[PDB]
Amino acid sequence: RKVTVATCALNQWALDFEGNLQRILKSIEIAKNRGARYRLGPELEICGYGCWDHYYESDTLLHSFQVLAALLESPVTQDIICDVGMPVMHRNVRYNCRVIFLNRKILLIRPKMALANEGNYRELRWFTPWSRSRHTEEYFLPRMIQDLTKQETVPFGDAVLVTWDTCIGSEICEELWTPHSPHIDMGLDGVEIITNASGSHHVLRKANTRVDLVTMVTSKNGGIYLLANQKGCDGDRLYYDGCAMIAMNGSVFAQGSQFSLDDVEVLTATLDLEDVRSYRAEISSRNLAASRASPYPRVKVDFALSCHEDLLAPISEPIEWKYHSPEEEISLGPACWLWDFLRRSQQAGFLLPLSGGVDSAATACLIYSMCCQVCEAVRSGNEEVLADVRTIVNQISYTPQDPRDLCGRILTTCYMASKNSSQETCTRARELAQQIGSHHISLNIDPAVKAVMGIFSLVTGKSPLFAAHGGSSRENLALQNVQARIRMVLAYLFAQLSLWSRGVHGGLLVLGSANVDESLLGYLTKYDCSSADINPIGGISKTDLRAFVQFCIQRFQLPALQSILLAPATAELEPLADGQVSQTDEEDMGMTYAELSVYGKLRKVAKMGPYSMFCKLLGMWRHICTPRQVADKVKRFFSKYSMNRHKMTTLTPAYHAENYSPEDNRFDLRPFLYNTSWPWQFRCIENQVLQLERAE
Amino acid sequence: RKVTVATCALNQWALDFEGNLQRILKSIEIAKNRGARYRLGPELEICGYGCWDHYYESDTLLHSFQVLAALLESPVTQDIICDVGMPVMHRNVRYNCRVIFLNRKILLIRPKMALANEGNYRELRWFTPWSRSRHTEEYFLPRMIQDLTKQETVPFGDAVLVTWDTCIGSEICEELWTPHSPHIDMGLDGVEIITNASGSHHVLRKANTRVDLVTMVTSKNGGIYLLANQKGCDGDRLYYDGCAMIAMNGSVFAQGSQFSLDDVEVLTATLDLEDVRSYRAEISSRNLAASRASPYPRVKVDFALSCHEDLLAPISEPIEWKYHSPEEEISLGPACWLWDFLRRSQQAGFLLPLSGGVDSAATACLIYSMCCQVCEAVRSGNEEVLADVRTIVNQISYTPQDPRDLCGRILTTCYMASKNSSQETCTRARELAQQIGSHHISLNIDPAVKAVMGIFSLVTGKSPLFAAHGGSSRENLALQNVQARIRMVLAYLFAQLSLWSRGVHGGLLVLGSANVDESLLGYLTKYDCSSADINPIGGISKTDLRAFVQFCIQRFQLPALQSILLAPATAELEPLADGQVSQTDEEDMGMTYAELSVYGKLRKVAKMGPYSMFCKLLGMWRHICTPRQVADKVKRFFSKYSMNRHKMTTLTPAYHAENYSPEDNRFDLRPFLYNTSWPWQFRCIENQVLQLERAE
Amino acid sequence: RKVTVATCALNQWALDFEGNLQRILKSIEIAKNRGARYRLGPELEICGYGCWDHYYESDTLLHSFQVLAALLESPVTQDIICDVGMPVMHRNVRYNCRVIFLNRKILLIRPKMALANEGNYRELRWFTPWSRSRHTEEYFLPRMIQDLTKQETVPFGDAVLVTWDTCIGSEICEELWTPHSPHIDMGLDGVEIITNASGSHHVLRKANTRVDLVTMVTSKNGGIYLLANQKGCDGDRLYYDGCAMIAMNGSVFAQGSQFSLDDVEVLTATLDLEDVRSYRAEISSRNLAASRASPYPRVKVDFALSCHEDLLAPISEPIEWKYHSPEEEISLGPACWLWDFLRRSQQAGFL
Ligand SMILES: Nc1ncnc2c1ncn2[C@@H]1O[C@H](COP(=O)(O)OP(=O)(O)OC[C@H]2O[C@@H]([n+]3cccc(C(=O)O)c3)[C@H](O)[C@@H]2O)[C@@H](O)[C@H]1O
Ligand SMILES: Nc1ncnc2c1ncn2[C@@H]1O[C@H](COP(=O)(O)OP(=O)(O)OC[C@H]2O[C@@H]([n+]3cccc(C(=O)O)c3)[C@H](O)[C@@H]2O)[C@@H](O)[C@H]1O
Ligand SMILES: Nc1ncnc2c1ncn2[C@@H]1O[C@H](COP(=O)(O)O)[C@@H](O)[C@H]1O
Ligand SMILES: Nc1ncnc2c1ncn2[C@@H]1O[C@H](COP(=O)(O)O)[C@@H](O)[C@H]1O
Ligand SMILES: [Cl-]
Ligand SMILES: [Cl-]
Ligand SMILES: [Cl-]
Ligand SMILES: [Cl-]
Ligand SMILES: [Cl-]
Ligand SMILES: [Cl-]
Ligand SMILES: [Cl-]
Ligand SMILES: [Cl-]
Ligand SMILES: [Cl-]
Ligand SMILES: [Mg+2]
Ligand SMILES: [Mg+2]
């Protein structure tokens, strides 16, 4: 009848065994206080999901087991079934596993059967899928575990648990949406509870597909579904957004946070198993298509999941899943990201080159949002967060209440004007900093620039001129770039010495402000301020950035943003001749951010090369453009793209948000020395155009 | 009786279909002129091996076929069997394939059955292995091919080719390295000739493994074995080093270049099939197993490998494989990789910061080596090299004979001294430049440094001091780093404007000079000159570098190097107080380049975390060090490594040389925000140390 | 973790049982003193490889067993696993065998599955290949052995050895050179250490082939690989040139002499089993095939290859194989072959 189960989101850290252990323990202790008899944790939670090439290392395996032993001998784990994740090597093959134990015995080790090998995922690099479906083998335990557990071997493979009162089965992360998912046969076999341990990272706007899936599955097959997921940054450019859930028969009973500053969040629910049994009768109490397939092996477990609590235990009522707006998503994720980055880097704060333009502004807003979250958290009684703030600012007695106050201690904004900067942009940056609370620095680079160009003249005997002073296209560009790069040099100097100049220990993380759209076209200066330490908006669309900044006005009460939004998007690096005004980035690029986004998505999402893309747009923009015209747009896109790709190889690491990122380290593997005339492809395009231009 | 076969190495280029088509045609034409009736190409040669995520694009598939259709309708391919590679989608699964055609008819498509998923390889990201052994399906041909070939379908799978006189089998690359390789069962079923198309890249010293393996195989199994490989840079960090070979019954019959400036290099041999047959007939255990061997599907082909060429057509005689010394390898690999960048980037030359030290010196030697190579190639009658040069140099009449004259056209060294630089280092740089013939630039950064520091003072009211002037540790470092990044600002300014100042069109690629040992430890300044466009020595050991440079003294007649070798490895950026001499980078790092090299190899090559590494060293350095000491060495390494790993994320792409490269984009994936205290792991280490101190 | 293993080259002599016995004992004693818990010998080392038509003689079989019984009751062989070779008649078929024993108990008898029948070799004249792959029969022990060992039978066939810490397989000589060698399927089924007892003779310039092959194998397949061989003249035209080796994951860890005037030369190495395991764990195509691999019969053994030696027992470091020039080979081969004639012919010199 009535059972009480727990799932959870943990902020795990790659190879951080000590912390990882304490987090797992805490969740189990929490679940037990709430009356749970089964606890589900995230995929590979013992070592942290993102260990990458450390999985090749045997030490990883070893410590994981030492962590497992600690769990097994811990008095908290008594009388609750615990499903943890670690790597495990069986017969010289490395598997991504679930280790399920109860009262100092291992019940079953259950290896993953479908591995993620797309986008940021590459599990086949380190793990093998279990291929012997509906079968188990005897796994031989480490003497370390034997001595403790008093078992020689345990079942290893595709099996389910049978207890005195129920039948629980495992579905690991992506097995949930893999063709022919375990949950189908488990359902058929009569499995009433299905646990899914995830490690899925944030992706702007796609939170609902996870929820929908679990929902549909429970709706279609009946049953309780448990989903646990990592939450936070585990040591790289991903943010895991654990929307841990508990679903039954198509309804949701517990909704876990997508972004929060909690290291441990536990969901429970009290459900009557008979609701499953009667909901399944409601559908098909009959037989099926006559399948006669090999049935699931069964691990007998001497334990009752439901135990006497009924007399008081309130049944969980169904709930509606509340989603975040896309702007709320943006204001929360990169924000919580930046918080883990700061706290785990053990760095003294951030250094933000603030230009008075939209992106640098958005970046500033993310920090302010971070501060708010921290204040919220501290108010909420979050000891970990309080501990951390106190450690970051060095003040034992400190207690952030006003976000502007915390911000000041944590953020240093820096406006670096050139000879041609307007008074307006300088002002806007000054105002925005004033409003969020940051320590603002305003300086002029021109003395350093004059000096560099002096060195050049001194040695070549030649003086480059700006385009407006009769300079060549090359000279103009070079000059612009020098200023860009001097800014970067200065940014790092302050990162390294500004706190020093204020009488205080420590150094700052440099933050970048490239957006995903310009990153793709390479419309940036190699090694200017586009290269920093971390970039939180690197993966966000320009349009979304504007959207996010306009949303910040009212949510954070920052009026300084209006002028910033209204101002013309221009880079004041070159003097303006009489009769003309500044050129906008969109004219500079030779395409609007809108249409740039389309190329982006057609390229990475829809997997189109130039010919394919030419054909798509030809129809999409059939009214607006002519065949010759789209050819030119596409050609212009691919050439600029290819010419600039090398800029991508060295680009600052970015929070992952859009599934159309051009990021080269993990998500978008590509050449960087292309033939930039695309002779063959472009010829195909021409032929098509010529063919169409034969119509009357 | 006698058959004439060809294999080759092509300098393919990712997505360069036009180019790739022309090079394949050339190989086939060269093959025919030399009398071959079979021609084998490299792995995925139509599209070029390294298209990475473009493999997801239908356009890659489509254009590959268009190339194929071109090959099929081409007169040159008449009466020679052609083994060509491309990706194929079959039943909506994407495979790495060989396509064998003859006289406008596709004979068979052979999919790869084992993929490479380690190191720089990750075929599983985009392809699936064919897994039905000795089995075949019908491939439905694209309409375009049908209209040309008048075929509806062709066999797709694990099949062999039967001619009137022989039986030909395919082994694709990594299949040769798998435990139960195809060549075993193939040889037992009477396949006489085995063809292997590879696409494997350079690794210092590992050339013999490929040779020994193919030789062993034909020795153990009998038969002729052909290997083809890409040669050169196809668009990324890798150099494919085509050691294409022909081997029979354990002897080599043709050895292809490892590094050469040739786009197309064809090997042919004339062999007697009767030698194969009698070699096999002499192995009793083989024959006992061959009269019981499981059969391969055979595609019957109306063709004779041995024609009316028999008339005294001279049988090929056995040869000894000649190898390169490790220094010759270094002298030739990155050199060719550099030529390929220069010509395929359509850039006007290189800009090399030259410090008067070993590594930058090495980089200079590579460029000179390249120059010699180009000169040698031109003297050989190589028309594409001569064209390529004239294009780079914009003078259609130019003929590089002297290596020093070419060098001055395409290289620009740049010495950049600080206030503290010594006169010696200046002169070493200058003397090296004179001797290789580069255009040398000598300047002082001090004016620019003062200007930047003046900016900092104007805005903070504080002035940083060098440690020798009582500055703090941080001040001293900030100061050193500033100078360092200023050098980078200048480097790019000259890269962009130096030719302009000399009244010449174009720009330069900036070369880096980070070695693989410093890259590992993070012993470099983020965004100093460590950050360039490409780094030809970023994957090479400090010890190999010295060895290389010392080799260059006699090989290239460059005496300036001796002083460069003999001089103390010091970075003159800070002033030294008297009573004290300048600190070497080895005491700066806190470890010798030697012990560093060991950490790096134990790390990547032996897959070792800090506990494992401590254990290994403890035994290795048992005489030299005490366990307490070993722990400190290991902890210091791991500490430094992980505090600095972020420097890897934005670091300049390096030519891949060692298999212990710490490169983060492809070869060595790792997190970049570690818990740098390594609590768990260091605890385990201290436990062992205590345990060892108590007992004895 | 770390295991210490031994292999050797013995100057055996056809039918010189007394002598052959003493040399085997010496190797095992040398092995134990150097800390090994496993000792591999050369092919047919009890009787000496080149007995030729004496293999037809029951006496060869009988006396081989008497030697074996001697080894079994010998104190020196306590607590080390010994791989020793002799011919065995089983169900009235004569096989070239490895006999593995431990502490007065025979663990398994592994018959040769491919014989050499070319050049100077002609094993088919006197032996039969074992042809039931991954299969085992009961060998009925001779009474003499039963009374000593208190065993009635022992497994006879294509089986592997499982200890507490590891899995050991046999490849006999020419099996390494066959197309579908045992080491392939063995490595996929988790055999960590492969032992090879050979008896192959000198051929000018061909030494590298043996080295390259064993190296290639452990490179491609992972694992430790031990090779033993006779060294010297056993009674005829041939000189066995024992290039005994120890190799792991594609590197050599011990190189034995090709020509030397030593009767017994033992190689030991100390290796970490964890290095094998992680080397294999890094090969995706291998692991995809290993999770689908057909199983070998296993003889369970109540023994640990890795003992309380772990205490700073120094791991063996990789070495480069040093070869002889063709002239050094000529200078050394026939020279040793000559010393062996002189001393074994009990003659006073040469004319
Ligand atoms: N295939 C290839 N592989 C490797 N490297 C390659 C290469 N092709 C060129 N390169 C090299 O890469 C280097 C590129 O860097 P660099 O020479 O500095 O120039 P680059 O970064 O290419 O040009 C900067 C761009 O930024 C834009 N801009 C201007 C002003 C402000 C802003 C802003 O929004 O902040 C942007 C401007 O319109 C311009 O197109 C060159 O040295 C070039 O030789
Ligand atoms: N976990 C983490 N994730 C992301 N970023 C992290 C981080 N931890 C620190 N950071 C940040 O990274 C930045 C590091 O750069 P920066 O502050 O400039 O300093 P950094 O590059 O760390 O220090 C430079 C090193 O170069 C050496 N050096 C000196 C002189 C000459 C030479 C030579 O051979 O050329 C070398 C010197 O001994 C020193 O150790 C800092 O802003 C820091 O806050
Ligand atoms: N005036 C400025 N002050 C501070 N940072 C700037 C300034 N201008 C540009 N940046 C930085 O440079 C990048 C944008 O380049 P740009 O479009 O030329 O303004 C972003 O990473 C900005 O943070
Ligand atoms: N005096 C110099 N002139 C030109 N390049 C230098 C100089 N010093 C350092 N570099 C560059 O900076 C890196 C080495 O840093 P450092 O060890 O401080 O000399 C290499 O990439 C060099 O090319
Ligand atoms: Cl163990
Ligand atoms: Cl069952
Ligand atoms: Cl400090
Ligand atoms: Cl803007
Ligand atoms: Cl804007
Ligand atoms: Cl200090
Ligand atoms: Cl130009
Ligand atoms: Cl040096
Ligand atoms: Cl040096
Ligand atoms: Mg903006
Ligand atoms: Mg140097």
Numbering used by the authors:
A (entry chain A), B (entry chain B): 3 to 698
C (entry chain B): 3 to 353
Direct quotes from the study:
NAD+ synthetase can be either monofunctional ammonia-dependent NAD+ synthetase using uniquely free ammonia as a substrate or multifunctional glutamine-dependent NAD+ synthetase (glnNAD+ synthetase) using glutamine as the source of ammonia. glnNAD+ synthetase catalyzes the ATP-dependent formation of NAD+ from nicotinic acid adenine dinucleotide (NaAD+) at the synthetase domain using the ammonia generated from the glutaminase domain21. Here, we report the structural and kinetic characterizations of hsNadE and a direct structural comparison of the closed and active conformation of (1) hsNadE structure in complex with a synthetase intermediate analog at 2.84 Å resolution and (2) tbNadE structure in complex with glutamine, sulfonamide derivative 1 (5′-O-(N-(nicotinyl)sulfamoyl) adenosine; SFI), and PPi at 3.14 Å resolution. Both structures are snapshots of the enzymes in the allosteric state with the synthetase active site loop ordered revealing an exclusive rearrangement of the glutaminase active site and the molecular tunnels.
The co-crystals of hsNadE crystallized in needle-like shape diffracted up to 2.84 Å resolution. Two molecules are present in the asymmetric unit as a homodimer, whereas a tetramer was found in tbNadE structure. Analysis with the Caver program reveals an intra-subunit tunnel forming within a chain in hsNadE structure unlike the inter-subunit tunnel found in tbNadE. The ammonia tunnel is also sealed off at both ends and the glutamine-binding pocket is inaccessible in hsNadE. In the ATP-binding site of hsNadE, AMP and MgPPi are bound in a deep cleft as reported in the tbNadE structure 27 with one Mg ion coordinated to three O atoms of PPi, to the main chains of ATP-binding site residues including Val360HS and Asp361HS (ATP pyrophosphate fingerprint), and a Cl− atom (red sphere). In this hsNadE complex, the ATP-binding site is fully protected by the closure of the P2 loop via three crucial contacts with the ligands and with the synthetase residues. In the absence of a ligand at the glutaminase active site of hsNadE complex, the Glu176HS side chain moves 78° towards the Cys175HS–Glu45HS–Lys114HS triad compared to the herein described tbNadE complex and the other previously reported complexes. In addition, this conformation of the Glu176HS side chain blocks the glutamine tunnel and clashes with the glutamine molecule as shown in the overlay with the tbNadE–glutamine–SFI–PPi structure.
